[model samples]
Structures are given as structure tokens and as C-alpha cells.
Target chain A: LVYSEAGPVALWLARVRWLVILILTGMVTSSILQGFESVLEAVTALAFYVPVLLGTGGNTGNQSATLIIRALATRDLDLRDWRRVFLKEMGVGLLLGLTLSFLLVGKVYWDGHPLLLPVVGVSLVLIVFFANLVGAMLPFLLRRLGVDPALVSNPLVATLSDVTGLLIYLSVARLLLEA
Target chain B: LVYSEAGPVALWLARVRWLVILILTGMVTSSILQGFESVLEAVTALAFYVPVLLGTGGNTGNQSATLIIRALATRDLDLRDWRRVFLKEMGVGLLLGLTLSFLLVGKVYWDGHPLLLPVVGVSLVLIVFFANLVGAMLPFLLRRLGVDPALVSNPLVATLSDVTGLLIYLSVARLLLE
Candidate 1:
């Protein structure tokens, strides 16, 4: 569903940008965080799987944000028109989150990070659930305040995903290790 | 300079997203690298400065992209014509790049990260200049390819910026770090 009529190429480029932003942001942030000792130690010890974890967070966020943008642009979704838009985005998020979570569990298990099997599993579930919520809510908040939802920013989504993802991972790690 | 009856709010929002994309991409990429124990160990000795570093790159790219968007949107630029657009964007990019590089050098020195002063300064210069070229050339490229530059996706600019930005940083870091 393209809102702009510039042509196939422009629309394709824009949508592809959606994917590029996530990959590049993940790659760039990973490199920079390399310069931090404590955070690096913790992250490396737990989430041995780097790209997929961040990539999932980014993709989920972008998907939800894109829906919100489309709705707002079409006027089908606004602060006043919140219910429908929220439901739609949240619904999309739920499906993507669950499906991705399922895939991640299998991948982690196969990677022989079995010590993290349970911890990463639970974290993936929570991350998917909340990342979607963050994805769904940010746009509504922006529009309610009469701001352009697009500019409200996707980086925040990535940030939220990182912080919460790590927190969830740590919490689950504690539980699994303790039990 | 306002262009189009469309609100400044919209334009500013659009510009900010572009900035966000640059920062987010650079930082995230750097973060993933941290997953590498050896790489993280080496770079961690420097400082966690990627956020500001990438922010600068984003700002530079956004500056050129937004200006070009405004100029073209308001008829200050013409797509059917190419010379005026290219010249205008380059002129603005050069002017901004030089000033920003000077400020960056001073800022690094003042912050007492003296060892990083030259590396950061040179990276900024290269990043900003290339950002200008890409930002300027992209719109023209879109038009020549018969696409609306506005719809070209600001996030894509961030990705392009990161790819080039990383290459510049890596090449310079290798040359200057020793």
C-alpha cells in the first residue's frame, strides 16, 4: 500500500529504506558499543546472537511505525481516530512478534547456546510483546499531541528495544540460573 | 527559508527523521560490533563516543538533504534543469562542512580527548563532505531516473551515510591510529 504516486522506483526505494535503516543502525550501534566495556561484557556474555536480536527489534518497530504513518497520512488514523489504528498496528505487531519469537527460539537452540536456551526464550517472548506495544503506542502519542508521527522517530524504537530487550534477558537469566 | 504551503512542522519533522536514521544506523552498527569480544576490547579503550560521532554525520547529511528538499520544493531548485541544483547544493555543503570541521576539532580538544582530536576531525570532514555529495546527488539521481526525490526515503540516506561513513572512519582510523 503506497501513498505516494511518484513511481514504482521511488516507492520501492522508500520501502527498501525501511529494511536498510534497521540493518545499518544495528551494525553501526554494535560497532560503537564496542567501545564500552561494561555493556560489552554483559551483552556478549548473554546474547551471543548479535544481528538477529537487534534486527528483529528494528524490523518490528519499523513495521509498526510504517503502519501508523500510513494511517495518519491517509487520515484513517489520528488521535481522534485512535482505536482502529492502534488495533491494526498492534495486531500486526502481535503476529510479527510471535512468529519471530518462534523462529528465534529454534535458532538459539541450534546455535548451541543451550545455557541461554530458557533465558533467551523468555526474553524473546517479552521483547516481542513489548516492542510491538512500543511500536503501536509512539505514533498515537505523537499524533495525539499534534506532532508528525514520522518525526517522532524510529531510533527511539530501536533504543527501547535494546534497553528492554537487555532487561528482559537479564531478568530471565537470573530466574533460569537461580532455578 | 520556508518552501511550500505545507507547514514548517512537517518539514522539520521530515528533517529530524533523517537525522534519527543516521544516528540510529551508525550507533546500532557499532553496537553489533561490540558483540565481538576482541573488537570490543580494542575499541573500548577509546570511549563510548559513537552516538555523538554519528549524530554529527546525521546532522551533516540532514543539512544538505533538507536544504535541497526545500530549494527544489519551492522552485528555488528545478529538476528539469541540473546545473543550478548541483551548484547550489555543493556550495551550501562546502560552506557548512568547513565550519563544522573547525568546530569539531575545537570541541574535541576542549573535551580533553586530545589523542582522538585529529582522527575525529578528519573523519568529520570526510563524512560531512561525502554526505553533502550523496545528499545532493541523490535527488538529481532520483529525478534523472524519473523518481520523486522526496519519496526517495530519508532512512536510505542514513544507510548510505553509514556505509560511506564507516569506510571513511575505518580508512582514517587505520591510517591515523598508529
Candidate 2:
């Protein structure tokens, strides 16, 4: 799998650079996280929710991304029908977000973080909505930009979601708590 | 893609249930993080590194996992070649870890978090090494257990990496910082 069908390891590394780029993006995200230190300290409980919010957002994004990426690879998805694709994902994202938010909010409430239930609930909805939109549509955008859809790795989608998810979580916490 | 191969919306919903499972795993990870509240407070800066470590580890793992899974799907990798696959990934993992750790340690030092350099560097190496190994081997193990390699989702590998990566980062932090 490391070697190539066309030729040698040298050529393979050209493609491997995409993975390097993906890792670099992760590094960028880490730097972004560092900047959120003050906010994290302001609402300490927010730190606990970080992993869950980012994790769930990333997971949901990866689910949609992987499904679409695979479909593109298999020719099961047509870029020409992006309207249908976008609509389907929007529907899926909304449904998934609502259901997951209900579950998560219940968990937060039971865990005695009822004040945060709204933040968690609303963040889940927005994160999932944005993640699914990006995840499902990114390949199309990439293809339009002349990049292979296969290069759309799962972690790439997840990392993108991580950054946005953090922003959403913090924004909600600020609005609901700081106010 | 939302619909199933041979069915209607009902079957689609059944498959969508897997996404639910993935989120549930996330919830579990959150609870696990909550348990580490003291550790997170003790090493406040450590909290910032959480997403990066897990993200990078999961990314590297997914890179290896995706390659192997694709090869398996295309019949390029064989079950009989497990030994070869493992060794190759070990080498790649080690090399990748060293390079990434070097870069990350430099960043930590420059960011004025010298106290965290060793913890970050060492965790990156260990986390990436373990993530690559697990990600590369998981599909084969799944196949051996009669599960389809295609069933190995990215979130599953990532969630696995995130859990283990957190432990690695915190353990290294405790050993080096505290």
C-alpha cells in the first residue's frame, strides 16, 4: 500500500504530502486552541465539554464526509447533482443534530449542568449543521478546485470541525453565561 | 449516499444509527475528560494542547488507516502479510513521530511553554506511534474477526485515538511536569 501502482516511493511521497498537509492543519488548530486559554479558564466546566463537543462535532462531520467522499470515489455521487446532495445532507444534519442534542442535553441535565444544557444543545445543533454542510460539500468544492476528493481525509474534516466547534461552544457559553 | 444500497428511508435510518453510536462515544469521552478536571486544572496549559494532540494523532492514524483500508478494499493488502504490514507501519510511525515531535517541541518552546515541551514532544511520539499501529492494524483485526474492513469508520479510529491519546498526554505530563 505504501508503494505505488504507477512507479516508485518517490512518486508516492508526492501524494503522501497531502497527509503532511493534513497534519500541518492539525498543528494550526493546536495553535488556535492555545489562544482560547483565557476563555477556558473563565468557565472551567467549559473545558470538560470541549472534548465532547469537538468529538461529537468531528464525528458527525466525518460521518458525512466519509459517506460523500466514498460516494464520489465510487462514482455514486455526481457533482452535477450537488443540489440534491446538499439538501439530503441538510436534512440529515438537522435530524441528527436534533436527536443528538436531545440526548446530550438530557445527559448534561442529569449530570447537574442544567445551566449548560441550552449551550450544549444549541452548540450541537449549530456544530452539526455546519459540520455536515461543510463535510458533505467540501469534496465538491475541492473537486472544483482541482483536488482529488480522496485527499479529503477524515481527520481533515474533523479538525476543521474542531476549530469551528470550539468557537460555537465558547460563543454560546459567553452569550448564555457571561450575560 | 444517504439512502442504502437496496432499501428505503427506513434502512437509511438504521444505518444512520451508526452516527448516533459515534456521538455516544463522544459523550463517553466527555465524561472521561470530566474525571480529569483536577489534572486539567493542575496543568492549565495542558488543556489547550488537548485538541491538538488528539487531532494530530487521529490525523496520522487516519492517514495510515485509510491507506491500509483502501488497499484491503482493492485487494492490494493480504491477511497473510500482516507481519510485513506491521513492520512497515512501525517504521513509518517512528519516522513520522520523530519529525512531528521535533516540530511540535520547537513550537512549544517558542510559545514560552518550555515546561510543556517534553510532555508535548514525548506524547506526540507515543500517541502517533500507538495511533498508527492501532489504525493500521484495526482493519485486519476486524477482518480476522469476520467484520468488514469497510465497517471501520474514521470516527471510530479517531475516538479510539482520542481516548488513548488523552491518557498518553496526561501520563507524560504527570511524569514530566508534576
Candidate 3:
């Protein structure tokens, strides 16, 4: 029962690159988590939000990347649109970062980490903003380099945001709490 | 110039729905994490993998869902193809689950968390499998309901899997470690 396009193994096998990319890239992101072990150790509560940060950041990044990827593919957006996109996405990212992080801070407040309110707030804004930027721009960068922007992949953008997301969170934690 | 499509605020405003959906759904997903607090306390090391699990799970789910959503959109596949898509995605999900979790287990082995190996490995496989099923089906279900399957956006799928992903990972941790 091996239909070419719809076969279980067929789609799975053809899509194996997604698995490989995630595994290889996931390792890099995990090590970033490991790198910030001490921050997590100090504020075990902060560890709780690791999933929260990555999940949200990846969502935001994937959303932006998809828009641009699809746009570039259909000729809806192009190099001429890059500057406007950067500015627009940054503004959107900033607004969303502010909005989402506010909610996150409210959640952390009930959990009683006074310091966490700021750390999560600031880090989230940075992560979401950065995610939007990378998501929008990476496709353009790859396109300019003569690669298909779709090749960037949702997980690829997610992992990119994940790497920087962790770095931003723990780096913020270290600054707010430790310093 | 305030171009309709290229304007920053224009795209941003039109796309606010993505933000709203993620925030609403994200709240649901985050609470699931809170529900698993005890499991996390018993093994703080497990906290590290929460992102690992969700990141991989979301990535995998988004990938499969995109496959189906795109295929269905182009009429490449349809209701007639649903059964095959399920079985196919299941096998793919299971295979990728096992392979990736093996590497995860290998990583944990070096970190010296004896029990974490199975917990991470098994949780990962199960998470990956479930993600594939949900990713493939939800779109079909939505389409059948007369909703454009496209409305089942990537993060929408990610949040669904995140809610279940935590439930799966923590539920397994309770069984194996506790």
C-alpha cells in the first residue's frame, strides 16, 4: 500500500529532513538551556517558563516567517518591501511583546516571584521582538542568497528563536536577580 | 504610503488575530504547565526538557499539519485520502519519535540522570506520535466542519499539542519516576 504522495512511509520518509533538522538544531537549543543552568538553579521557578517562552516565541516567529515565505513565493512581498516589513514587524512585535509579557508577569505575580515579574516581562518583549525580526528577515536573507525562503522551515525559525529566546531569558534573569 | 499589504501597521493589524489566538490558547497551555508543578519539583532537571519536548513536539506537529493543510488546499489530497494520511503520519511520527528520543536518551545518559533516560525517551516518542495525529486530523476535522482548514494555524496546532504535550510528559514522569 505504497501510494507515492500519500503513503505513510512516503510522506514520512520524504519529510525526514524535518526530523533531522529539528534533532540537530534542537541539540543546539538544548545546550543553550544547559548553558543557563545556574540561573535556573537559582530561580527554579524561572525554569517553569522555559516552555512558555519558547512556545510563544516560536509561535510568533513562525507566524511572521510564514507570512513572508508565502508572500515571497506568490510575489506578494519582495526585496522592495523589506524595509517596511522590518519597521512594521518591529512595531507589531513591540506591541505584542508588551501585551503578552504583561499577561505573563501577571501570572508570575500570583506565583510570588516579585523579581520574576520584570525578568519575564523584559525577556519576553525581547524574545517576541527578536522572533518577529528573524522570522521576517531570514526569509529575505535566504532569498537574496538564492535559496528558497520556504526552506527556512517553521521549526528552523522556531529553533532560531528558541536559541535566542533562552539566551534572552536567562541573560535577563542573571541581570535582574544576580546583579 | 500606507499601502494595503506592505504597510507595517497594516500587516500588523490584520495579523492581530494571530496574536489574540495565541494569547488565548497560550493561557490554556500555560495552565497545563502549572498543573504539572509537582512533577517538575521532584526533578528540576525535567524542567530543562519541557522546552525540549514542546519545541520538538510543536515543530513536528507544525510540520505534519502544514503538510496536510497545504495538500488539502491545493486539492492534492482530500477526504478520500484521510485514512491514508492518518496511517502514514502515524508511522512517520512513530519513527521520528523513536529516533529523536534515542538521541535525547543518549544525551541524558551523559548527564547522569538514570531514570530520566526512559522518561524523556518514552515521553518524547509519545509526544511526537500524538502531535502527528492531531496535526493531520484537526485540519480535516475543521474542513469537514466547513471551516477553512487554514484557520487551524501553526500556533493553534502548537498550543493544542502543548496542552497535550505537557499532559503526556508529566503524566509519564509521574508513572515512571514517582
Candidate 4:
């Protein structure tokens, strides 16, 4: 199973294409039903930043997912060893987040959205931490349930992170605004 | 080197934990920054949707990136192979964007932000396309230079996507508004 003898690479690539078709069909159907351009423009400036942030968050999340998956796939990590795995990933996520915030927040500050510096910094922290944890937890959790971890992968990771990250970002944002 | 050693696992896990700390500090510090509560609130509402869109975009990008990375890793693809990879990814991105946009735009339409369809649709298209290219290229380009593809990895990939995604979104927003 680990090695798809039918050429795993080709199969994987085909699956990726299938995934895209599914997403496209979803989008076209939604577009037909919704079809609005103006109001979105109003939030477009601020809204545009969402995908970028989400991309980063999801990337981080996926990376963790991949690492964990690989680790488990090879038995370098075991479900019985959740403590070590969790601690290790938390450390990685924290360091990764700090380095990025310094680089990214600084960029925002220079871009004249000085107010966004804190927002980006805090949001990145929470998103990365949660992302890492989720990434680490999901695979192991899936294993416990006898489900394939890779089966629920980057797409779902990003989706969960996006939903939660948005809520966290907003809550932090709300607090920042109130202050 | 390809063997499954505990040493690599230890090192990899450590790397992940270090990453978490960095993110936490950034989030906490940013939250602690001064002024702009109202702006923060609205932005917060907007921020909620970001991770989902980004997750989709990143997932799409990663899909392409993984393909490219694996292709190069196995020598199935080369730098000159950009055209095929690009075309494939763009098609994927377009389909993904349209589907996601339609769903979100439909919601926004009913929510009294019908105009948002294009704003979000075009934005998603741009984000997914860019994410895909960046995701695909970074690993190959790094590999081409004899660098470990992992060096151009998750956090870095995400960061790069974010920086560029932001700029693209902003430009589109500016265009749509003006």
C-alpha cells in the first residue's frame, strides 16, 4: 500500500487532477447562484489579504501534516508516543511562527498598515500553533480510528485552519480594535 | 540518508516545535499592539474567512507543488517542463477558484454583498494560481540549484505565498474599487 506498484506517482498526479475538477464544479455552481461583484469590491482590499494569510497558514499546517504522516508511515513515530510528538511539533511551530512574524509583520509595518503589524503578528502565532497541533494530532488521531491520516490531508487541514484561523484572527482583531 | 532513523525524526519534530514558538510570539505580540479596535473588529470578521480560502488555495498549490516536487525528485520533470506543469496547475487553480468563488459569492450575494462575487472570485483565482506556481517552482528551483528541496519547504512556501498573495489581493482590490 505504501508503494503503489501501478506507479504511485502517476496515480497521485491523476488524483490531484480529480481533486481540481471537484473544486471547479463546486465553484461554478456557487458562482451561478451567487454572482455578485460590487460589494465584494468594497472589502476587496482587506479581503485580498485573506488568501495570502490562509495560504501561509495552510502551508504550515500541511507541512506538519506531511511530516507527521511520513514519520508515522515509517513508524519513526507511534501512536503510543503522542506526548513526544506533540511537544516536538509545538516547539517547531512556535519557532517557525516567530521567525515568520518578524519577517512578515515588519513588511506590513513598512507598507504603511502599521496597525496591521500586531494583527499579523498575533494572528500568525495562533494560526501556526493551532495549525501545527492540528497537523500533528489529526494523523495520529486518524490512525487511532483506523482511518488513513493522509486521506484527510492538506485540503482539510487548510479548511479547518482557515475556519478556525479566521475565528481566531477575528477575535484577536476584535480585541485589538476594542483596545 | 533515506533510511528511517530516529535521529531524523527527532530533528524534524524539534524543527516543528521551534516553528510553533515563533508563531505564538508573533500572534501574541501583534494582538498586544496599540489602537484600531474598530478596524480590528471588522478585519477580524474578514479574517475569519481567510484561513478557509487560504487553506483551499494552499491545498491547491500544494497539490501542484507535490506533483512538481515529486516529478523532479524522481526526475520525471525538469525545469524545461514548466509549460506542462504550469498549464496543469492553472487549469486546476481555475476550476478550484471558480467552485469556491461560486459558493462564497452565492453566500455573499444573499448576505447583501453581491458585488463581492467578482472581488472574491478573481481574488481566489489569483491566489490559487500564484500559490500553485510558487509551490511548484520553489522546490524545483531549489532542487535545480542542488539545494535540499525541504529547504524551500512548508513555512517558507507559506510565507512566500502570503507575501505575494497579499500584494495580489491588494492590487485587485484597488483595481476593483477604482
True contacts kept of 3: 0.38
Q: Which candidate has the highest DockQ of all?
A: 3
Which residue window of length 10 is worst by lDDT in model 3 chain B? B1-10
lDDT against the true structure, per candidate, is: 0.53, 0.74, 0.77, 0.56
- Fold similarity of candidate 3's chain A to the true chain A, as a TM-score: 0.86
Give TM per candidate: 0.57, 0.88, 0.90, 0.63
Q: Candidate 2 lDDT, tens digit per residue, A76-115? A: 8777866777777777777778878888888788778767
What is the alpha-carbon lDDT of model 1 when measured against the actual structure? 0.53
What is residue B67's positional error in candidate 2, in angstroms? 1.9
Interface RMSD of 1: 13.8
Which candidate leads in lDDT?
A: 3
User: Which 10-residue window of candidate 4 chain B scores lowest in summed lDDT?
Assistant: B28-37
| Model 2: residues with Cα > 4 Å off, grouped in runs | A1-16, A70-77, B1-15
In terms of TM-score, how similar is model 4 to the real structure?
Answer: 0.63
Model 4 chain A scores worst on lDDT over the 10 consecutive residues at A29-38
- Candidate 4, residue B39: how far the Cα is off, in Å: 13
lDDT of 2 by residue, B1-178 (tens): 3432423234247545776777777777677777767777777777777777888788877777777788887888787767777877777777777867887787777667877888898999999889988888888888888988666647678889988998888787777766
Pairs of residues clashing in candidate 3:
A8-B88
Task: Please give the lDDT score at residue B31 for candidate 4.
Answer: 27
Q: Quote the true-contact fraction of every model.
A: 0.02, 0.40, 0.38, 0.13
